[PDB]
């Protein structure tokens, strides 16, 4: 009796000067069966933070419910909504709480910090913690994170302008990388959810991907 | 339940436009043996919720007992509040995940059908704790050979009426009995609509064997 | 004071535990709840007292559903009554979970009586300050009605009345052929009895809560429908005028 | 009501609530409650007695004082 | 082992072989599989003897106490429910499958089968034990609704004879018990009273 | 008395239990709070006291899960304990069942929890009265719970010191409720607090708290300058 | 009459009062006075140290202590209960930092300490009587400088200016007279020391007082002898 | 000596347990009376049955309980305590049969109940529940047996006993009737018990205002005699007396 199943999933997060994009494929399989087509993998923890959970779906759901409950408890205790950094630290503690029966779930929090700039944190199942600038996770992260390195970090491209990426360009980057992901990774595809976090709020945008 | 002793088989659920219709064999298999055949693997949780399991029948019976007692307690309260199909789905998901984490799983895969507030609900609580709300569900070994038909029909016509939904579930159970070693030609169809839940007895398929001779 | 009336674990020099008697006194100070066991069912009526016009209708229900087929009519401290209703609900749930069928009312009454006796044994807890009645009906056992009191005695009954007006209620119930009446008429008789025993110049406001469990419900306890309660109330008022005349 | 008959007691007083709050007063103590309510209304330049004046009357009759105790919400 | 129960109007007949192996050696060859739970309810046991006996004794204790407290004869459903609770709870420790058959005033002539696990299914005729399968298929054809007590007795005898004939782990004498209003009548078919080829 | 009111475990020789009555008296040491409800809203309005002109005004409306708020009158320790218990119960219900806990069931849980102390010698009855405002799919609810472990489903109620003025106002004007806009409803609550206020005193933004829940309105607490649109609109005596 | 109603912390009086909580609040007065002032430029704490005799070095009377780098506590009451509650506050602030990776707000830490204090006889916390100590948590958080007062009953509330201890009733009046919102931290220090000199039987000079301040910036700073003398020069 | 009176565990300066004595007074508080007599091959318990209301179900009203298939008891005292102790006796008998494989002897069940009561008399956790249990059964080697289990741990066996208000009068009557041909038959034992109750209460019994339970060697199952049997006994024995 294996208590884990890999449900597949691809999530991506890009920070920025004033925005945070958190996107996820909507496909959700249980092996070689596409099974459900809906149920994206990005949750709106608060109007300034969205968390993308990938991997075992039962653990994704339970961890999301635990995070929401803990956000409510913090709100009642402190009379103020959690900041993105506080959510990241609390989630690190929660993930490490089950260090000897880990949540089989890769987490990427993305949202606005207190100063108002974008911020992306990436966690491993046991509860590691790092404030990256842009990170991919899940199954297609292997073929996604390199292109983000190329086009947001300008890696290996000498003699280039280091213009901060705009929201439109970041969205185009996300959509293109996820098109290539839907093509090359069988798990990825079947609709794409985008959550843009900015001072205005959280904008949800859906893009059709390869149905297979 | 580390080892499933006497298991059911695939359970189907389709989102009728004004309700939900699920289908399930009456066969409780013990390995490669029919054993018990006159057992219903569908439960009427309440006026607007119904359940169908495709795993260890003992575990399904335990869950049926627990759910029935919960609904009885709620009715005893009788304060005008009723468990929604989604509420039953969430409670079932939490119970299954809790026992998974405890490493004492309930070896059941369950379709939850319901019709509340004019909204049809269909969920897929499995053994480990995976929970869904897909338009059509085919749990068990019937996923591979039943979900395709339902998906193609739904994509060609997203909204289904009573007659066509019933015909589609009949054809899917037909294919299941055709090519499922642990199936049986006696299946119940339970339909939940605004008027309540009705389980339509021991229906049978009119199998055509001259097709392949 | 007596000196032996503190703690329910002390026997006075007569064999009397006075805390249980004080609990009985507490129950014999509340509104009146009666219950009559007709041939094909049991009907509970309670003269709930609306202690303020602010409380909405149906507040402080003294008729609980203790299991689907069993109704409970309480009289006394309503907090203790709710706790006992929860205890009886849990006992019925445990019975159905273990043995697999609806709890017999005789057994349910015995279990709850043993619980009440548990709380009257000790000095760390006070005896339950309420009496109650358990009524049910089934094809294989028949209509049954039991009464439990703070001391924990579970005698069966044909007609029972607990609360302020218990003696008068029993007097007015004796003059009934309950053993051969039907639910549809015993409900009206219950309403009439409650209205007669109710005191208007002392209790002021008043609300009649009725319930039956009987053959015409397939052994399922429930609150008497609106129209039936209205007709029984009208008949009770007419009968009050007739008795005055 | 008897001992407040000859006063300017406002119609809004709730003698049922007063009887609930008494808790083992004599009839003499009830009369004193009425008298002290009258005196308290005479204080604070009141043209009518009021239920809160009656409450202060019960307080003075028992000789107790009402203070905003700091550990009460 | 092999155990069977058949329901007839107003009663029920249980039957069981009398073999108890510990491998390929018959530790006991006149074992009494049938066990009287209360007075009319009987349980036919299969699986590990220790677990089955412990469960039967515990259920006898529980049902006796329940019936004495209720002042009423127990229900076959109640006895089978106690068996189901224990078996389901201790699925992983109990290698026991049981058939509870009996008579009660309300639903006389009842047969429930709690196989390995915790199932709870009433049946017109129930079969269990290692040698079940063969007679299981045979009774699928032989059974006909509306049998009387004598026809049910012959049916059970022939079925268990077939199972004993074709099963290495079953063999010995055949113990039958007919339960109804009048009570319980138990008999044994030793060597010749049992069919020869059918 | 004098030997029958030392603990909750002793019945007095009159069928009367004294420490519960003493807790029900403790509920009157709080401050006035009036709850009331239309057909699509529920409003708690509380008169916040002040321990000194420097110290802020003690909060009296607390925020249970989004569809429930609470107004407290009595011991603040017990208020905190019961608020924590209610929050935990609502969270547990929203975790197990993906829906808000019904208010009529939350109040039953509170009743059982508060009744347990009133029968065993290990603690004192919770000396805090509660006005629970909530909005479940049935409709807006106002509940009252008293230290006796008794709860009443009230269409409009008031508790605390100087409560009968507000209760009489509510009895007089409750026929208006139900068919009221939210502003009119809050105005009626503020009028009730005015009635319970001493004549020389008046309702100021400093000492008034207004919690509102209802359809398409998650429980919101208005304090300090948030109550200005209500008090400003309120007519003067 | 308060002989069957104030012998235990879980016995109500006919008026509905916890006389044991009353008595703990009374035990508060036996400590030396402490005045905290909240201002837009920070928060100040100033306490009457009550040296009984020389040979007891001053760093053993801890009336002003540090909770994290952004809160100070001015205490009045039993030293033992003071130590217990101060330790709870410190550990709670560190726990919140560990979990959420940020500084606990003054209100939240006061709430945690009050939550510890509520549990007189609640049989699931083990203390059996109210903590006979009253605290002033003056700190700085994202909401600007704040000062909170907590009492034995567990009740806490913010205070633009407060005084606890023996000279509480007679010093809060002076605080009311002299305090206004648009006050600088130097003005608050001067006014607090003036009130302390008013309410002390001993003369104000160098030792016998402690002064501390938490500002939007530098951490909680306890004035040493030099700063104390500089302020006392022209209080 | 009244100070040594409010606690079950305090010895009076002369070594008395006033709370236990008060439990006995509680026995003498239900108003009812019970008598028990054993013949050669039968035992009989007879209890006064009060049903002071037409609305009270006489079938449910009773003081004769079937502790097990072959053991019966008559309880006198507080009804709640009586039923609690009856449940305890049934549980103990079931445990005995489970553990040891044979039906509990009557004397053993009495010793178990008496020990349970002695525990409460020694420790201070409960009050000694104020009921008296008279048990009857048929022992395979001894014969008919009648026992008492008073609420202090005393459980002597009896040729004939009584409990309740008129226990002393019934005891004197049974002493006189047993000094002369203690050898009684079934009918003679029922006669003796019913006559003892009637004479001590100063009343002649209707068939309903009395409840009789019987065990016999030929039929060793506790049987509660029906109204017809009670009336037959009364009429026939009064006629032929």
XYZ file of N, CA and C in Angstrom, chain A residues 62 65-66 68-69 72-73 76-77 79, chain F residues 59 63-66 87 91 94-96:
60
model
N -5.320 18.850 0.972
C -5.248 18.958 2.425
C -4.332 20.100 2.844
N -6.129 23.402 2.314
C -7.102 23.633 3.374
C -6.413 24.025 4.673
N -5.284 23.387 4.983
C -4.542 23.731 6.192
C -4.023 25.159 6.107
N -5.308 27.646 4.366
C -6.433 28.561 4.524
C -6.860 28.659 5.983
N -6.930 27.520 6.673
C -7.293 27.540 8.084
C -6.285 28.341 8.893
N -6.767 32.010 8.408
C -7.882 32.505 9.214
C -7.487 32.641 10.681
N -6.765 31.653 11.217
C -6.323 31.741 12.606
C -5.398 32.933 12.816
N -7.465 36.115 12.864
C -8.155 36.313 14.134
C -7.183 36.704 15.241
N -5.978 36.133 15.235
C -5.030 36.385 16.315
C -4.355 37.745 16.204
N -5.335 40.412 13.798
C -6.144 41.491 13.239
C -5.489 42.095 11.999
N -12.957 46.449 23.215
C -13.728 45.887 22.117
C -14.799 44.950 22.656
N -15.028 38.606 15.934
C -15.272 38.098 14.589
C -15.060 36.587 14.577
N -16.152 35.828 14.668
C -16.110 34.388 14.452
C -16.135 34.224 12.938
N -16.034 32.993 12.444
C -15.881 32.753 11.012
C -16.806 33.642 10.189
N -16.409 33.908 8.944
C -16.882 35.044 8.159
C -18.375 35.316 8.269
N -14.532 29.981 17.329
C -13.681 30.061 16.149
C -13.149 28.689 15.769
N -13.940 26.705 12.292
C -12.842 26.262 11.439
C -12.910 24.763 11.191
N -15.649 24.092 8.690
C -15.255 24.495 7.345
C -14.125 23.638 6.796
N -13.407 22.923 7.660
C -12.360 22.017 7.204
C -12.940 20.671 6.797
N -13.752 20.069 7.664
C -14.372 18.789 7.333
C -15.378 18.969 6.203
